[PDB]
Design a protein around this motif. Structure first.
Motif, mmCIF file in Angstrom:
data_model
loop_
_atom_site.group_PDB
_atom_site.id
_atom_site.type_symbol
_atom_site.label_atom_id
_atom_site.label_comp_id
_atom_site.label_asym_id
_atom_site.label_seq_id
_atom_site.Cartn_x
_atom_site.Cartn_y
_atom_site.Cartn_z
ATOM 1 N N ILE A 26 28.788 36.005 9.036
ATOM 2 C CA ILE A 26 29.774 35.650 8.012
ATOM 3 C C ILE A 26 30.657 36.843 7.608
ATOM 4 N N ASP A 27 31.963 36.719 7.822
ATOM 5 C CA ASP A 27 32.939 37.735 7.392
ATOM 6 C C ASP A 27 32.713 39.133 7.973
ATOM 7 N N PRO A 28 32.907 39.287 9.294
ATOM 8 C CA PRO A 28 32.867 40.604 9.915
ATOM 9 C C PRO A 28 34.085 41.413 9.501
ATOM 10 N N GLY A 29 34.000 42.064 8.345
ATOM 11 C CA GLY A 29 35.160 42.695 7.724
ATOM 12 C C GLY A 29 35.779 43.861 8.464
ATOM 13 N N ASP A 30 34.940 44.746 8.983
ATOM 14 C CA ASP A 30 35.430 45.932 9.667
ATOM 15 C C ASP A 30 34.266 46.636 10.354
ATOM 16 N N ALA B 195 28.044 32.604 16.436
ATOM 17 C CA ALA B 195 29.362 32.243 15.913
ATOM 18 C C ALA B 195 29.731 33.057 14.678
ATOM 19 N N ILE B 196 31.014 33.393 14.570
ATOM 20 C CA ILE B 196 31.557 34.073 13.397
ATOM 21 C C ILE B 196 32.121 33.069 12.394
ATOM 22 N N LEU B 197 31.546 33.032 11.196
ATOM 23 C CA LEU B 197 32.052 32.183 10.113
ATOM 24 C C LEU B 197 32.833 32.986 9.068
ATOM 25 N N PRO C 261 37.412 42.662 17.702
ATOM 26 C CA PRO C 261 36.424 43.407 18.488
ATOM 27 C C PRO C 261 35.231 42.539 18.861
ATOM 28 N N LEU C 262 34.528 42.025 17.858
ATOM 29 C CA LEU C 262 33.355 41.191 18.103
ATOM 30 C C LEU C 262 33.626 40.071 19.108
ATOM 31 N N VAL C 263 34.776 39.420 18.981
ATOM 32 C CA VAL C 263 35.108 38.316 19.869
ATOM 33 C C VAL C 263 35.308 38.804 21.299
ATOM 34 N N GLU C 264 36.036 39.906 21.455
ATOM 35 C CA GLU C 264 36.314 40.443 22.781
ATOM 36 C C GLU C 264 35.108 41.122 23.404
ATOM 37 N N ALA C 265 33.970 41.057 22.724
ATOM 38 C CA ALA C 265 32.760 41.688 23.229
ATOM 39 C C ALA C 265 31.655 40.656 23.452
ATOM 40 N N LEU C 266 31.712 39.547 22.725
ATOM 41 C CA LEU C 266 30.671 38.533 22.845
ATOM 42 C C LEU C 266 31.211 37.109 22.924
ATOM 43 N N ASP C 267 32.530 36.987 23.071
ATOM 44 C CA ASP C 267 33.189 35.688 23.219
ATOM 45 C C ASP C 267 32.776 34.639 22.190
ATOM 46 N N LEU C 268 32.400 35.069 20.987
ATOM 47 C CA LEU C 268 32.011 34.131 19.930
ATOM 48 C C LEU C 268 33.187 33.258 19.472
ATOM 49 N N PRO C 269 32.925 31.972 19.199
ATOM 50 C CA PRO C 269 33.955 31.160 18.578
ATOM 51 C C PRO C 269 34.093 31.573 17.117
ATOM 52 N N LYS D 243 44.630 42.886 14.605
ATOM 53 C CA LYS D 243 45.027 41.498 14.353
ATOM 54 C C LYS D 243 43.963 40.513 14.833
ATOM 55 N N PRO D 244 43.483 39.639 13.930
ATOM 56 C CA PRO D 244 42.452 38.663 14.284
ATOM 57 C C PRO D 244 42.923 37.740 15.408
ATOM 58 N N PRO D 245 42.007 37.361 16.308
ATOM 59 C CA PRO D 245 42.350 36.659 17.528
ATOM 60 C C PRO D 245 42.424 35.155 17.315
ATOM 61 N N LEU D 246 43.200 34.482 18.156
ATOM 62 C CA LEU D 246 43.192 33.031 18.201
ATOM 63 C C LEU D 246 42.611 32.584 19.530
ATOM 64 N N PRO D 247 42.106 31.341 19.588
ATOM 65 C CA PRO D 247 42.184 30.354 18.525
ATOM 66 C C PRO D 247 40.984 30.412 17.585
ATOM 67 N N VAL D 248 40.872 29.419 16.703
ATOM 68 C CA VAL D 248 39.740 29.301 15.786
ATOM 69 C C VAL D 248 39.329 27.835 15.656
#
Ligand SMILES: [Fe+3]
Ligand SMILES: [Fe+3]
Length: 198
Positions: free
Chosen positions: A25-29, A47-49, A63-71, A98-103
């Motif tokens: 929940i909320d990967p702020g930085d 998953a990131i909420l 970062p997290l998404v480009e490392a673990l492909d989480l939705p 910049k946060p990635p799309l999609p969501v």
């Protein structure tokens, strides 16, 4: 529950363990602090909420998404903010990738990962809360603080909204554990009698 404090504004990202396992929940930085937190935890997030799309809550998502492909789950009403979060960051002299799309869209009444999604606008248009009745708790982002409440002058905020939204929250289990996006945890019961906003 892996309360963990990231970023210059010290926001509160959470790793939670549910029936369907780990979520974030909320990967702020500070991805590394987060990525390295997983190194040891062993729990990787399925998953990131996002409770809302404010830059101080979504700065590590890329970062997290480009490392673990989480939705990435986010309430659609916050997309606009979410998509502009990086410039918002620069208004504080800060900076985020910049946060990635999609969501994947969040929605009132929606159940996921044991949680029960409540839409609670006011701090922002797409602000939600993650209620865990099996946990006896709630991840309510910037909605409720220990002795305070979410800002209501940031672009997209609305006091009347924030207020009806809070009253909602404050009608659940007094013993409910609050996990806010900033500062010490608390309870709906405690805030009821102590908070100057109530
Ligand atoms: Fe916020
Ligand atoms: Fe915040």
């Amino acid at each position: 529950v892996f309360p963990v404090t990231l970023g210059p504004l010290q926001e509160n990202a959470y790793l939670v363990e549910t029936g369907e396992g780990p979520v974030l929940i909320d990967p702020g930085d500070e991805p590394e602090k987060l990525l390295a937190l997983f190194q040891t935890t062993g729990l990787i997030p399925l998953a990131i909420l996002l409770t809302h799309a404010h830059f101080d809550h979504v700065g590590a998502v890329a970062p997290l998404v480009e490392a673990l492909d989480l939705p990435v789950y986010l309430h659609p009403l916050d997309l606009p903010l979410y998509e502009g979060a990086d410039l918002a960051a620069r208004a504080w002299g800060l900076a985020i990738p910049k946060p990635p799309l999609p969501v994947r869209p969040l929605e009132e009444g929606m159940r996921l990962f044991g949680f029960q999604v409540l839409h609670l606008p006011g701090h922002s248009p797409g602000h939600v809360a993650f209620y865990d009745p099996e946990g006896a708790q709630v991840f309510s982002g910037d909605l409720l603080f220990r002795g305070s409440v979410g800002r209501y002058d940031l672009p997209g905020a609305d006091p009347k909204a924030l207020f009806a939204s809070l009253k909602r929250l404050l009608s659940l289990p007094p013993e409910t554990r609050v996990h806010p996006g900033h500062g010490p945890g608390t309870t709906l019961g405690l805030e009821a009698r102590t908070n100057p906003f109530l």
